[PDB]
A paper describes a structure:
It serves as a scaffold for rigidly positioning the target-binding domain to immobilise guest molecules at well-defined positions.
EngBF-DARPin construct L1 has a shorter shared helix, but the molecular packing only permits binding of small targets. Using these mutations, DARPins B6 and G10 were fused to EngBF using the L1 construct. The Cys1655-Cys342* disulfide bridge confers sufficient rigidity to identify the DARPin domain. The narrow space in the L1 construct causes an additional crystal contact between c-pep1 and the host lattice.
Numbering used by the authors:
A (entry chain B): 1 to 15
B (entry chain A): 338 to 1684
């Protein structure tokens, strides 16, 4: 459900 | 003598007719019942829309006999330019009265001038307004009318049923069918009228709107009389083509109409339209060859497309034999889609051009002749609305033009389609001559024509019933049964509609004929109804009569699932076809008909089936079928329950599995199949059989038919793709049998022991069982297996030959023409590192041989049986054709061997051994047996784009790549808006249509087609045409295609002028080198073209011809030079281990080890040292470019603006990517280097490049706050609505961050505010969840703008 900052190899959603 | 009436008589009735007009006064049946005709003095004749009333002096009468009278009508109107003499014949037979116009004389014309020229004062239309041939009155007991109009909508019935009362008031109310009943009699009116009128629902024209009956009321004393008349007939119709040219065309037939008077025909104690409908079958037109429709159990499409020859005619014959075994010989109807020219949607409208790569007319005739012995009928897909420049029929007169004089463009796919001028094609005699070309090829062997798209207004704005009648006539005249695309189309002559039979297409508004009247009349004559597809509701919710449910397994829309095809046949089609062997006699309690939808007088019998729907059907031998619905309430589980009885015995019961594939049912049946699969005659009492199906599986008990009641046992066989298996003897007790069945498994029941259907696999194919359809036994009876390894027939769908270890599979070749040239090709998928081979021998000596190592190219041919969506092994398929070319030996002794060499555990798959006459002789070998040269002008390709194979630029598709064909001037640059030649040399070339901006491989050679020896040097050259600069590139690779591991060389524009490309290639160490054509990320230059001209111009196309591959001499090296080259390479790259990918270091080590093997081998020669040196030079060039790519990405991330400029100038790939798939543009946008972004975009970087997360540079720019980078990207064509792998768009990221400017620019360029990510969240939803209420309201205002 947590939204993180996008970047290389890092998707917007992690749950 | 002066008596104003006469009497015509039969044994069934007497009819009084008027002498002053072809009118009936009344019909009196033997039993004394009376039906009225035209009781009033009505003498109207309509010609060309003008009503003329006839006087006593305008009509002459002659009674020919007791059954016939003749009238001569003088029809004149000087002011309206009408001066005609109409001859009318009235005849009677049994309970029928016929009224025919036998002669039309025009006093104002000499006839139609030569070549269908305009006939001045032509009699175009004729009718008898309010003729009232039959009538009913409001004063008669149970006076009623039933009418039918066309409906393709499952929720909208086409019928009307009402009482005729004093208030009934109609004037030329038009219907496809009309029936009147009153005072114990019923009659329908038949006419051959081509009139188009009122319809309920139809998505197209094409004969959907044919209404032939006119109903009119008049006052007859104190009562209202409802009379039936024919709708107008066309005689000498004047028409206009797309260029304004006028023509007069003669009648399809002379005007005809009839009535048939019925009493209580079905003996149910009521007289209504159903009684009239039974008598009506004796007078109605019957579609040509409609008598064979109940035999057509197995319909399907066998597809060919884009020069590939996915389904050669002799392969289709084997598939017919597979279906025959699995259905125990039930009739089949195979639609050949792509039988002609290069395949489906190639060569339209050259009907006579039989696909040469499929085996031509000769194989098509063998397939049809041999197939008919299994009850298989064949037909071809034709198009009379769209054509391609390649078609020999393509001409300026054939071209449909618009009001402005421009081309009426069709669809662009392989080539640009052009609309056909339909009026010109008919009136000039062009279309009928192309059908005659086809008739010359097929003789009397072909069963039907399938006419695509007709009615969609592609050929003209009309395609009316008159054009459709003429179209169907020219088809039926050649002995061909008529079939068409649209559900509602061609009511008069079609026996099948693809959009009625394939229930998945178009939705609930565009299916088959939703009419109780039409289906009652013609269910047994057509596959044009509504079958079970419960998501459509209404007519599609478990129709009692079933209805054809068509599936396919031979490539149509990628369909290849053989087991699902057979399962579907037994689920819906066997019972549907069983029901079609009987004619409807009674139909009550229809839940679709209500007072609300205009059917208050529809029959509601509470004494039949508890007031629920029931249909009774009968054949000519007095057999009775009763079909009953469990409940008329759609909310009840019993709505879908159906019982079928045969002579009062239950033969089927339960719920069918939903036709839409959404719910398995419980239906079981034991259907007596009493008919042969030819003309449908009864089989000898001893050969009678029953088909058994049990949806859920289990045990059921049945009462056998009357002729089986005294048997003590029956023989039961399970049906498979091998035929009858697992024979069981089942006891009969008191005329009953108990059967145990597996779920959805077909069984056939005989009175005694039944013989196997005889099958000789691959007749005319020069080998027995070329497709491995003979089961395990084929490897013993047909093919010979030898070796320590294993050979097996594998795969439950399309069976293949599977090899493991050291094994040879061989068979002698038959029927070869001594001294003639042949290509032998076989589908091969090799998962082993060891070689898989095809060899042709003659007395132990090798005539030709070919091999493949591990297969490197996945199959992307949608219509092909072993494409990569079909799972040959491990979720993929690498099937590709492997060729040998040889001359049939004088001794007539030749053998094919399929083999696997290595002793490893990996598999090799083979399928479809094809031996074909072929003149290709462009391969030259070295003494070694290795390649000396390969030349190809593509003039003799057995199939496909050999030595190339289609790649994955469109995934599994009907690939927009094929062999283009010459037809000057239409295929050449300069015709209309065309700027490219389709063909460069001779008659054929390789054409790529519109595959720009794919950033991937379009097509490539593979080692089984052209093998490049490790270290050997080759000069490759070809002629080409390319629509724009750098849209296509030459790709050179090793092994399975990898983005980044290919050398690319951009090709410059060569538009309408042939360019030349040439390069050198050094064979890679693994012998897996190849070259091909790659689609770059570069946008084409459309040169200001708009609309269809963008596709027809050729700006996006690539044509290749005159391929030449030749082994060349390389500078000779000593062992010392090769050893020094090893030291130089090692000195350059050994220190770069940490800076390299694990796969990149292994490839480097692999190449070095292999180069050293060449150098250090005992007995190595100058050729080995030269190869070793050349491998190392190629390795150097490769490692060099990978380092420049790695440095371009590093300079982009760190922000070294000038370093980026020199690296790109030195050769670095602007579209290279790192570990996570970031291009230098992704890295420049992410870190915020506006200049680097601008420079990379100028160079030619993919603006919409995606990394591993699906992020485009815009996603990274918007999410990190780089405003100008966003604007620059958008200007260059960055997709504003690009969604990452979680459905997140730049607007979502912009809303989640918090700046209005991002939101505004994105929205201005077209950002979807209603974009939902994978969690269903919109950018607004992400804004409110982080405390960004400001942006949330701006987003809310933006969403409310388009509310
Ligand atoms: Mn009746
Ligand atoms: Mn096969
Ligand atoms: Mn050529
Ligand atoms: Mn073409």
């Amino acid at each position: 459900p947590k939204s993180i900052r996008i970047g290389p190899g890092q998707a917007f959603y992690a749950x | 003598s002066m008596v104003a009436c006469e009497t015509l008589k039969t044994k069934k009735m007497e009819v009084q007719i008027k002498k002053n007009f072809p009118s009936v006064l009344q019909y009196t049946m033997t039993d004394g019942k009376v039906m009225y005709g035209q009781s009033k003095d009505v003498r109207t004749v309509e010609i060309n829309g003008t009503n003329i009333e006839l006087g006593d002096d305008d009509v002459t009468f002659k009674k020919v006999s007791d059954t016939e009278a003749t009238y001569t009508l003088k029809v004149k109107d000087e002011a309206k330019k009408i001066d005609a003499v109409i001859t009318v014949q009235i005849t009677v037979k049994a309970n029928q009265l016929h009224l025919n116009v036998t002669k039309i004389k025009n006093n104002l014309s000499e006839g139609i001038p030569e070549g269908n020229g305009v006939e001045e004062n032509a009699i175009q239309t004729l009718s008898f307004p309010n003729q009232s041939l039959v009538s009913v009155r409001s004063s008669q007991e149970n006076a009623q009318f039933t009418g039918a109009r066309m409906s393709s909508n499952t929720q909208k019935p086409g019928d009307t049923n009402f009482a005729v009362t004093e208030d009934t008031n109609v004037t030329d109310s038009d219907y496809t069918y009309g029936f009147i009943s009153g005072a114990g009699l019923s009659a329908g009116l038949w006419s051959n009228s081509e009139h188009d009128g009122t319809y309920v629902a139809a998505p197209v024209r094409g004969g959907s709107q044919n209404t032939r009956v006119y109903a009119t009321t008049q006052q007859t004393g104190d009562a209202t009389s409802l009379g039936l008349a024919s709708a107008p007939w066309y005689y000498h119709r004047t028409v206009t083509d797309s260029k304004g040219k006028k023509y007069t065309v003669a009648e399809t037939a002379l005007p005809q109409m009839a009535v048939a008077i019925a009493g209580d025909e079905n003996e149910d104690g009521a007289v209504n339209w159903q009684d009239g409908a039974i008598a009506y079958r004796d007078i109605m037109n019957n579609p040509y060859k409609s008598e064979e429709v109940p035999e057509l159990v197995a319909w399907r499409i066998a597809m060919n497309f884009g020069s590939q020859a996915q389904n050669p005619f002799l392969t289709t014959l084997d598939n017919v034999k597979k279906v025959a075994l699995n259905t125990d010989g039930l009739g089949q109807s195979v639609l050949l889609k792509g039988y002609g020219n290069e395949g489906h949607d190639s060569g339209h409208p050259d009907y006579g051009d039989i696909g040469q790569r499929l085996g031509g007319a000769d194989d098509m005739n063998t397939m049809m002749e041999e197939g008919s012995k299994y009850g298989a009928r064949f037909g071809v897909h034709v198009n009379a609305s769209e054509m391609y420049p390649e078609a020999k029929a393509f001409s300026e007169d054939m071209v449909r033009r618009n009001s402005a004089g421009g081309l009426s463009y069709g669809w662009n796919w392989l080539d640009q389609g052009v609309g056909i001028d339909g009026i010109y094609d008919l009136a000039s005699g062009s279309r009928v001559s192309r059908f005659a070309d086809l008739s010359k090829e097929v003789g009397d062997n072909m069963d039907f024509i399938y006419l695509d798209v007709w009615g969609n207004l592609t050929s003209s704005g009309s395609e009316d019933s008159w054009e459709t009648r003429k179209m169907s006539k020219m088809i039926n005249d050649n002995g061909w049964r008529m079939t068409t695309e649209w559900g509602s189309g061609n009511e008069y002559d079609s026996t099948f509609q693809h959009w009625a039979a394939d229930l998945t297409y178009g939705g609930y508004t565009s299916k088959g004929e939703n009419s109780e009247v039409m289906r009652f009349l013609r269910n047994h004559q057509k596959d044009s109804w509504v079958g079970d597809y419960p998501q459509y509701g209404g007519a599609a919710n478990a129709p009692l009569l079933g209805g054809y449910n068509m599936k396919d397994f031979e490539g149509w829309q990628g369909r290849n699932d053989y087991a699902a095809y057979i399962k579907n046949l037994y689920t819906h089609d066997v019972s549907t076809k069983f029901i079609q062997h009987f004619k409807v006699t009674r139909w009550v309690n229809n839940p679709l008909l209500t007072a609300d939808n205009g059917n208050a007088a529809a029959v509601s019998d509470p004494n039949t089936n508890n007031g629920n729907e029931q249909i009774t059907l009968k054949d000519s031998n007095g057999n009775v079928v009763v079909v009953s619905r469990g409940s008329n309430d759609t909310s009840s589980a019993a709505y879908r329950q159906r019982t079928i009885t045969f002579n009062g015995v239950k033969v089927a019961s339960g719920v069918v599995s939903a036709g839409d594939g959404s719910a398995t049912g419980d239906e079981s049946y034991l259907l007596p199949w009493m008919w042969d699969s030819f003309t449908g005659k009864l089989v000898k009492d001893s050969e009678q059989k029953l088909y058994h199906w049990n949806t859920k599986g289990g045990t059921t008990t049945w009462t056998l038919p009357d002729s089986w009641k005294n048997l003590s046992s029956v023989k039961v066989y399970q049906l498979t793709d091998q035929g009858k298996t697992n024979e069981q003897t089942v006891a009969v007790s008191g005329g009953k049998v108990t059967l145990t069945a597996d779920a959805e498994t077909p069984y056939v029941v005989y009175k005694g022991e039944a013989k196997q259907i005889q099958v000789n696999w691959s007749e005319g194919m020069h080998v027995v069982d070329a497709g491995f359809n003979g089961g395990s036994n084929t490897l013993t009876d047909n093919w010979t297996v030898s070796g320590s390894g294993k050979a097996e027939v594998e795969g439950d769908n399309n069976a293949m030959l599977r090899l493991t270890g050291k094994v040879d599979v061989s068979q002698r070749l038959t029927d070869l023409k001594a001294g003639q040239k042949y290509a032998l090709y076989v589908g091969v998928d090799n998962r082993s590192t060891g070689d898989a081979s095809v060899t042709v021998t003659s007395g132990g000596k090798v005539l030709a041989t070919n091999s493949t190592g591990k297969s490197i190219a996945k199959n992307y041919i949608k219509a092909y049986g072993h494409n990569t969506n079909s799972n040959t092994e491990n979720g993929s398929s690498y099937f590709q054709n492997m060729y040998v070319f040889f001359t049939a030996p004088e001794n007539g002794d030749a053998t094919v061997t399929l083999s696997h060499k290595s002793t490893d555990g990996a598999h090799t798959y083979f399928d479809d051994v094809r031996i074909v006459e072929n003149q290709y002789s462009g391969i030259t070998y070295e003494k070694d047996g290795t390649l000396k040269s390969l030349t190809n002008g593509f003039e003799n390709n057995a199939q496909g784009i050999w030595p190339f194979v289609v790649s994955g630029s469109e995934g599994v598709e009907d690939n927009r790549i094929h062999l283009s064909e010459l037809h000057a001037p239409f295929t050449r640059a300069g015709w209309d808006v065309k700027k490219m030649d389709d063909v460069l040399d001779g008659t054929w070339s390789v054409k790529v249509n519109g595959l720009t901006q794919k950033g991937t491989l379009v097509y490539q050679t593979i080692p089984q087609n052209v093998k490049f020896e490790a270290g050997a040097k080759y000069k490759v050259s070809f002629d080409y045409q390319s629509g724009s600069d750098d849209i296509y590139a030459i790709a050179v690779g090793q092994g399975e295609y990898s983005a980044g591991s290919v050398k690319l060389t951009n090709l410059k524009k060569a538009l309408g002028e042939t360019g030349k490309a040439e390069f050198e290639l050094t064979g890679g160490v693994n012998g897996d080198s190849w070259f091909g054509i790659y689609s770059t990320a570069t946008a084409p230059d459309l040169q200001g073209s708009t609309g269809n001209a963008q596709d027809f111009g050729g700006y996006k196309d690539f044509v290749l011809d005159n391929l030449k591959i030749e082994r060349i001499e390389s500078q000779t090296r000593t062992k010392a030079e090769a050893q020094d080259k090893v030291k130089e390479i090692r000195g350059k790259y050994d220190s770069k281990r940490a800076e390299l990918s694990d796969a990149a270091w292994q490839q480097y080590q692999d190449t070095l080890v292999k180069a050293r093997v060449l150098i250090n081998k005992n007995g190595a020669t100058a050729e080995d040292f030269t190869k070793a040196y050349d491998i190392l030079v190629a390795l150097d060039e490769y490692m060099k470019l990978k380092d420049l790519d790695r440095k371009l990405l590093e300079a982009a991330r760190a922000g070294q603006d000038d370093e980026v400029r020199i690296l790109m100038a030195n050769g670095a790939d602007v579209n290279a990517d790192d570990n996570t798939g970031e291009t230098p543009l992704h890295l420049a946008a992410y870190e915020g280097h506006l200049e680097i972004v601008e420079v990379l975009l100028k160079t030619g970087a993919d603006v919409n490049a995606e990394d591993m997360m699906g992020f485009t540079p815009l996603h990274l720019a918007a999410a990190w706050g780089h405003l100008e980078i966003v604007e620059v990207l958008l200007k260059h064509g960055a997709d504003v609505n690009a969604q990452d792998n979680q459905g997140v768009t730049p607007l979502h990221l912009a809303a989640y961050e918090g700046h209005l400017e991002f939101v505004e620019v994105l929205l201005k360029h077209g950002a979807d505010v209603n974009a939902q990510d994978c969690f269903g969240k919109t950018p607004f939803d992400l804004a409110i969840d982080n405390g960004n209420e400001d942006i949330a309201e701006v987003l809310q205002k933006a969403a409310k703008l388009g509310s």
